[PDB]
Amino acid sequence: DVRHHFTPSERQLCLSSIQTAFNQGAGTCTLSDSGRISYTVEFSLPTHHTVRLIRVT
Binding site for its own copies (CB under 8 A): 1-3, 5, 14-15, 17-19, 22-23, 25, 28-32, 35-45, 47, 50-51, 53-54, 57
Q: Residue 54 Cβ, how far from its own copies at the closest point, in Å?
A: 6
Q: Residue 55 Cβ, how far from its own copies at the closest point, in Å?
A: 11
Q: Residue 42 Cβ, how far from its own copies at the closest point, in Å?
A: 4
| Element (DSSP H or E) covering residue 44 | none
41: region left, alpha or beta (phi > 0 left; psi from -120 to 50 alpha)? beta
Burial of 6 (0-12, 13-18, 19+ CB in 10 A): middle
